[PDB]
Amino acid sequence: TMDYHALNAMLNLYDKAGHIQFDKDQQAIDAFFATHVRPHSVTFASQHERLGTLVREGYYDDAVLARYDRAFVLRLFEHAHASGFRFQTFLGAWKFYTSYTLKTFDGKRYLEHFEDRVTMVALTLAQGDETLATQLTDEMLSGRFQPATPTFLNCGKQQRGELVSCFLLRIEDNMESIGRAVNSALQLSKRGGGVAFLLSNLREAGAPIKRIENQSSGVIPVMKMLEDAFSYANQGAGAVYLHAHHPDILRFLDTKRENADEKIRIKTLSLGVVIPDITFRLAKENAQMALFSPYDIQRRYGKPFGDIAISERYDELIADPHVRKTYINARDFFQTLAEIQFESGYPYIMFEDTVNRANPIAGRINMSNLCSEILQVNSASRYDDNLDYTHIGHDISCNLGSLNIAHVMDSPDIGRTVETAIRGLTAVSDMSHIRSVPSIAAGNAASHAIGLGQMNLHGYLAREGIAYGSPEALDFTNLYFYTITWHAVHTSMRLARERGKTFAGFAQSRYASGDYFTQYLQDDWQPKTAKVRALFARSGITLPTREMWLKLRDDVMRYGIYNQNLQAVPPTGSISYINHATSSIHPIVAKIEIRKEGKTGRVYYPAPFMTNENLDMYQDAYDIGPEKIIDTYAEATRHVDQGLSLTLFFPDTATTRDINKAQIYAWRKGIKSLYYIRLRQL
Amino acid sequence: TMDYHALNAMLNLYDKAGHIQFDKDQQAIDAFFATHVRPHSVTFASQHERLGTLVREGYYDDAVLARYDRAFVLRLFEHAHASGFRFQTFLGAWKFYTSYTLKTFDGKRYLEHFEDRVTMVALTLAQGDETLATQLTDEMLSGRFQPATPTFLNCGKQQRGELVSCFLLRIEDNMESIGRAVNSALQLSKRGGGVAFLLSNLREAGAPIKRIENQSSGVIPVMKMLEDAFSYANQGAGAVYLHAHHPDILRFLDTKRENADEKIRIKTLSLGVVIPDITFRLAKENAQMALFSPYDIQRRYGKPFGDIAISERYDELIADPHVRKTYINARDFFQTLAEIQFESGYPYIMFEDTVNRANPIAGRINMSNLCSEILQVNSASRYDDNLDYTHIGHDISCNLGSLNIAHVMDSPDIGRTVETAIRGLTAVSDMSHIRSVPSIAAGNAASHAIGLGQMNLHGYLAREGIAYGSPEALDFTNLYFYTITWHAVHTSMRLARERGKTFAGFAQSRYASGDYFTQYLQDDWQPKTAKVRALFARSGITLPTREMWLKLRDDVMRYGIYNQNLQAVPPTGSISYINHATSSIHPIVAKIEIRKEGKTGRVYYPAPFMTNENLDMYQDAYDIGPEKIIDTYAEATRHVDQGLSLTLFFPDTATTRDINKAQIYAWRKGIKSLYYIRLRQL
């Protein structure tokens, strides 16, 4: 019966009673291992000899093993293979062997299995610490923690790409900066990519140059340039963010219209827009939108457009005659916005006042990343004519990992679970040295920002018989994130003691003063529901209490924190299939997801814990709709210091107004940002 | 009668006897000065007060005057205005006031007249030396010398652009270099522009990267990137050169085809192609053309494609199995070549063996400039990951100026005439510090290359009743350049004594060994003709003699030379109209040239010394044809150490074969390069 594809395909059939036949997927795993994995895996007389061979023939990096006693290494591997790990789905297994595990240089045999890859990851992150390493191994094999693909994929390998592949850069209003950006785009893209540029500081189309009254091609030409950079370095991708109140806003959005011109046509780059609070109020009362000149604003306040608070100074700015102001219709802005999103899925939205109002770090937040999940502060750089740095500013980069909620709730020692992931991601940052872009490097060194995310929320809720979006769900979500947060700040606090240093700028932060905690010292803490009350109960998990916050608040005000930023909820792409989770805290996109991969062209993927006796608990995001989704992310947004990738799923019948209403709701509810607008499918 | 345009227009009418009515142009000058120049020029109570005012209100740069005793400055100005300078044509006057002379900041009055601008130029170049300054003034006012527009236009002004605006850069086969190039393109273009890049070292489309077998998008994506750079920084322009034997040659030429695709479509960038001797031989015997991989060549010889001698190692390379070789048809190469030129005017051709065979400087010449007149050696640069220079190579830049042949022959002291121009251009280089591109700066500092050119050759020949292309013309051309050359090497030799230093690398040069002079120590020196013999006679000019060369050869082998390169014959654009010369040593493009400028849309320009009694001596380049033109440039190419911009003018009936035959002839005759293919007009 050894066709694994056909077996998998069986997941795509319903019996006269609309039931699936889930066992067939297991059979497909089995036949996969028997007909393909085993027959093409390389097995050694022993671990010792294996590590020997792999180092010798150039596959594994001895440098990583050299930080441990060989005996320890051999033990850890064995412990790993004895955990009794199993892939839960054909896709997970297939995805791991086809694109994660290590193969021979000629691509014909496999040199690694799950526990192996895991082990090496653990060894790399723990960098000498045996306990840590062991903990990493356990966390990963239990399915509890699951680092982002760029980490899980390269750790320990000799031929590896970077561990960090997510960057946010500023551009300053001058050729030096622009030239650097293009260069940074080349350098980064050329290995992993995932780069976003802020364009808000650039002078508008028409602004003067060198005293000559009307010369400025605007941001478009700058975009075209990035677009080509990215294209040339083939892999990586780019995004640009522009403030809503920027004079080029409309032509900026027009680039993503099928029907416009050739040099107002950016096909690859992703767009993102920053929208402050007022522009909402203006549209409410059908007023005009004032677009301010970044050129004038600079000369008149000594700060770039992107470093000032538009909303706060909206009036002050309008009254100032020195600032040229052009106008457009607020409502029309949101109109074209929805129209573009409607066709391309973009832009992204970054709710500038909501974000800065929550931002505990000194400074402002003016952009976001390619997945609209990262939110940190940055600072300008200054260059010499020869392009040498004169002052190295701070740009942003971050590594990610997330832990499977379900599995977390299936283990009493949550504190350990969180401390370990945080330690591991922290190690990722510590080991990062992106020298090709000094600001990126400098930035990482001064902040140690990491992003610990969550996934499998829907999968969890389903299992425990809770409907997505319901009041119980909303209550879990809130308390669960309430918790994770505690253990993280705690962990980061501890780290600060051990390393005897905090993140740069800690002193000016909110953590230092204690304001960060006011929220957790007031009540709305305990369970709105009873079921939820019992879930944490049955779990052994202990919801942090006033005393515990009060305590942490003192340990934090005194010892500090290591990481400037801890949490962040990006979309879990393929790592989620190997971990067998529903992609983040958003409902499943389908009961049986279909991917276009392999000889068959199709590969099917059933959701976690889903059986023919609870299908009614697995409703797709389209069915659940945006309201319930938004509502969920909101409970989380209260705690996650960074941000979460939020995609709305709309029917194909939906209208721009529908979209627009979802967005307003989002704004109204506290959402820090929005990702795509996925209209219906093929 | 005070319409100057209408008067000018009169030059566009023929009487029943096909005669023009040249006096009307003079009338147009007169009415111009009376109705426009005078009424809008600003005149001061005295020079002293003027220099005072202009420095105070921000127009003139006191820094330049501060290197002289004010009294000297006042004198020089007066001497200037007393020379009795006159514009010879309405266009010259109109061109000077509309786009060279200094105006008030609001653009409504004139602050300068010819002698004024000249003076400031002299003051700037002479940098303290009164004699020099005075000489500069005389040379310029007599119409003898005429510096390139970027110099004549900015010297002395407070708001000025750079004096040097002509650059040639290398690109190395790696992202750092590519990133820098884009940046250099931005930086340079953003002020004057005129930049050319060598692409020959870049790996071909398909070559490996990082061991991965088929990844290299080739040169096109790199071109698109430059193209966008140039576009963004609005002004400046770019060129790319590619070796004929480079694997991407065909797709490189295909970019300039109307009918090809969208991402194989470079509209702005100019193309140039380097073609060695063999590819000619191969096409002769209808063989195949071997295209070698620059990727392989590097790994196997430690030198980039562009630093090796293809022709010399053509066989050796074909036999080497390590060098991947693709093939195309030689004859087909030249076919598509002519076809492209046919439609766009390009490419340019750089006859690589001819050039290196003449090149007296140690090293090879692999590219050229935007006007195909510059030919020097360059050397690679090496960068650190952060884009910082690790080793600063030597790129190329050059400033130009040329002297009106006629006026030169109308003055006995040619030696002074040449020494002065050389001194002045040398000062241009000495004062150049293009810090935004270290290699450019380093290069200029090590070579002090300048380019002294010629113009008004046709105008001269006509006046003296010699037909362009005739044996007498060919004889003058040769002897005249024979002469200029002497006085230049002499001048540069002298400079080396005064400054007590020579150009870097002098020792490895040909000047040091003495081989440069072998040519001038053998005969074909004296006049083939008798008329020519008398021209130099009537002039007082003394054709250098064996003893004079023998002497210079000893002074040179001992004291050295200051400039690595001296001569170069670019096209004289607008400066030629103000100087009233025929554009370089090529026949006139018309008897009454028409330019599309001003309120009238048209402005007419009669050639020098042309009257209704010698029209038959002024035949256009179309009439003269390419053979005679080529023949002329050949006589000059024997002496000019750098190169000359050679454009062929073909009838609209011409065919690619016609073109191709002109090119072969050119190659055969010693031409170092070719510029456009101007097919007939509108």
What DSSP string runs through A220-282?
HHHHHHHHHHHHHT----EEEEEETTSTTHHHHHHTT-TTS-SSS--SSSEEEEE--SHHHHH
Task: Enumerate the β-bridge partners of residue A327.
Answer: A290
Question: B20 in contact with A at a CB cutoff of 8 Å?
Answer: no
Name the 3-class secondary structure at A288.
Answer: strand
Name the 3-class secondary structure at B240.
Answer: strand
Task: Enumerate the β-bridge partners of residue B453.
Answer: B402
Nearest of B484, B423, B495 to residue B641 by alpha carbon: B484
Please report residues of B whose CB lies closer than 8 A to that of A228. 221, 224-225, 228
B369 is catalytic: yes
Name the 3-class secondary structure at B659.
Answer: helix
Residue A362 CA to residue A505 CA, distance in Å, equals 7
**Which of B223, B387, B395, B437 should be substituted to probe chain A, the one whose Cβ sees the most A Cβ atoms within 10 Å?**
B387
Beta strands in A170-232 (DSSP E): 195-198
Omega cis (within 30) before B524: yes
- Domain ranges in chain B are 3-143, 144-276+330-682, 277-329
Please report the sign of the dihedral spanned by the C-alpha atoms of residue B95, residue B97, residue B99, residue B102: positive
Q: In the PDB record, what is the listed experimental method?
A: X-ray
A579 is catalytic: no
DSSP code per residue over B176-203: HHHHHHHHHHHHHHTTT--EEEE-TTSP
**Helix boundaries (H) for A324-404:** 330-344, 352-358
Q: How much is the CA Rg of chain B, to the nearest whole Å?
A: 25
Q: Which residues contact A601 (CB under 8 A, 6 or more apart)?
A: none
CB contact under 8 A, B435 and A187: no
Residue A509 CA to residue A547 CA, distance in Å, equals 23
Cross-chain CB nearest to B232 (options A225, A232, A437): A225
Residue A99: CB atoms within 10 Å: 13
Please report residues of B whose CB lies closer than 8 A to that of A224. 228, 231-232
DSSP state of B530: S
Residue B673 contacts residue B349 (beta carbons within 8 Å): yes
Nearest of B573, A667, B360 to residue B581 by alpha carbon: B573
Omega cis (within 30) before A147: no
DSSP code per residue over A73-117: HHHHHHHHHTS----SSHHHHHHHHHHTS-B-TTSSSB---HHHH
Nearest of B351, B371, B272 to residue B572 by alpha carbon: B371
Residue A238 contacts residue A268 (beta carbons within 8 Å): yes
Residue B536 CA to residue B533 CA, distance in Å, equals 6
Residue A616: CB atoms within 10 Å: 8
Residue A323 contacts residue A293 (beta carbons within 8 Å): yes
Distance from CA of B206 to the nearest CA of A (A): 13
Residue B669 CA to residue A88 CA, distance in Å, equals 78
CA end-to-end distance (rounded Å), chain A: 32
Residue B609 CA to residue A362 CA, distance in Å, equals 76
Residue B680: CB atoms within 10 Å: 11
And the tokens for A622?
A: 């389209």
Beta strands in B354-472 (DSSP E): 382-383, 389-391, 396-397, 399-404, 450-455
Question: B222 in contact with A at a CB cutoff of 8 Å?
Answer: yes
Q: What's the CA angle centered on B38, arms B37 and B42, to 5 degrees?
A: 100
Kindly give the pairing relationship between strand B648-649 and strand B325-329: unpaired
Residue B427 contacts residue B162 (beta carbons within 8 Å): no
B144-276+330-682 and B277-329 in the same fold = no
Nearest of B114, B131, B128, B126 to residue B80 by alpha carbon: B114
Nearest of B322, B336, B236 to residue B283 by alpha carbon: B336
Kindly give the pairing relationship between strand B673-674 and strand A325-329: unpaired
Instruction: State this model's resolution in angstroms.
Output: 3.0
DSSP code per residue over B547-562: HHHHHHHHHHHHH--S
Residue A253: CB atoms within 10 Å: 21
Residue B270 contacts residue B237 (beta carbons within 8 Å): yes
Which listed CATH number (3.20.70.20, 3.20.20.70, 3.40.50.11750, 1.10.3720.10) goes with A144-276+330-682? 3.20.70.20
Name the 3-class secondary structure at A646.
Answer: coil
Q: Which residue has the tokens 């959402």?
A: A671
Q: Which residues contact B75 (CB under 8 A, 6 or more apart)?
A: none
Residue B336 CA to residue B254 CA, distance in Å, equals 9
B183 is catalytic: no
Nearest of A494, A509, A403, A409 to residue A145 by alpha carbon: A403
And the tokens for B29?
A: 């000058």
Total residues found in chain B within this entry = 682
Kindly give the pairing relationship between strand B592-595 and strand B603-606: antiparallel
Q: What's the CA angle centered on A655, arms A654 and A661, to 5 degrees?
A: 100
Q: What count of CB pairs under 8 Å joins A to B? A: 78
And the tokens for A623?
A: 């069915």
The kind and range of the H/E element at B292 are strand B288-292
Question: B388 in contact with A at a CB cutoff of 8 Å?
Answer: yes
The kind and range of the H/E element at A438 are helix A438-447
Residue B369 CA to residue B376 CA, distance in Å, equals 10
Name the 3-class secondary structure at B348.
Answer: strand
DSSP state of B670: T
DSSP code per residue over B605-631: EEPTT--TTTGGG---HHHHHHHHHHH
CA end-to-end distance (rounded Å), chain B: 32
Return binding residues of A for substrate: 149, 165-166, 194, 369-373, 571-575
Residue B333 contacts residue B244 (beta carbons within 8 Å): yes
Angle between the N-to-C axes of helices B621-637 and B471-499, in degrees from 0 to 180, rounded to the nearest 10? 40
Residue of B nearest to A185 (CA): B179
Total residues found in chain A within this entry = 682
**Which of B182, B188, B384 should be substituted to probe chain A, the one whose Cβ sees the most A Cβ atoms within 10 Å?**
B182
The kind and range of the H/E element at B579 are helix B575-579
And the tokens for A559?
A: 């010892």
Please report the sign of the dihedral spanned by the C-alpha atoms of residue B485, residue B491, residue B497, residue B499: negative
Angle between the N-to-C axes of helices B47-56 and B70-81, in degrees from 0 to 180, rounded to the nearest 10? 110
Nearest of A449, A460, A471 to residue A403 by alpha carbon: A460
And the tokens for A422?
A: 């945080």
Q: Which residues contact B49 (CB under 8 A, 6 or more apart)?
A: none
Task: Enumerate the β-bridge partners of residue B273.
Answer: B242, B349
Nearest of A325, A161, A345 to residue A256 by alpha carbon: A345
Cross-chain CB nearest to B175 (options A178, A190, A221): A190
Nearest of A271, A247, A245, A251 to residue A263 by alpha carbon: A251
Residue B378 CA to residue A593 CA, distance in Å, equals 59
The domain over range B277-329 is classified in CATH as 1.10.1650.20: yes
Question: B187 in contact with A at a CB cutoff of 8 Å?
Answer: yes
And the tokens for B462?
A: 């006509």
Side by side, the strands of the sheet bearing B450-455 are B145-147, B399-404, B450-455
Residue A511 CA to residue A226 CA, distance in Å, equals 37
Nearest of B267, B75, B228, B240 to residue B170 by alpha carbon: B240
Burial class of residue A250, CB neighbours in 10 A (0-12, 13-18, 19+)? middle
**Helix boundaries (H) for B502-562:** 510-513, 515-521, 531-539, 546-559
| Helix then strand then coil, % of chain A, to nearest 5 | 45, 10, 40
Query: What Cα–Cα distance (Å) separates residue A216 from each residue in A207, A301, A383, B235, B648?
Result: 5, 21, 21, 13, 38
Please report residues of A whose CB lies closer than 8 A to that of B232. 217, 221-222, 224-225
Please report residues of B whose CB lies closer than 8 A to that of A159. 211
- B569 CA to centre of own chain: 5
Nearest of B334, B393, B399 to residue B366 by alpha carbon: B393
Please give, one letter per residue, the 3-state secondary structure of B64-101. HHCCCCHHHHHHHHHHHHCCCCCCCCHHHHHHHHHHCC
Residue B542 CA to residue B409 CA, distance in Å, equals 11
* Residue A214 phi, psi (nearest 5): -140, 85
Residue B213 contacts residue B253 (beta carbons within 8 Å): no
DSSP state of A676: -
Residue A452 CA to residue A32 CA, distance in Å, equals 33
**Helix boundaries (H) for A500-574:** 510-513, 515-521, 531-539, 546-559
Residue B346 CA to residue B267 CA, distance in Å, equals 12
Residue A276 contacts residue A263 (beta carbons within 8 Å): no
And the tokens for B304?
A: 């980039």
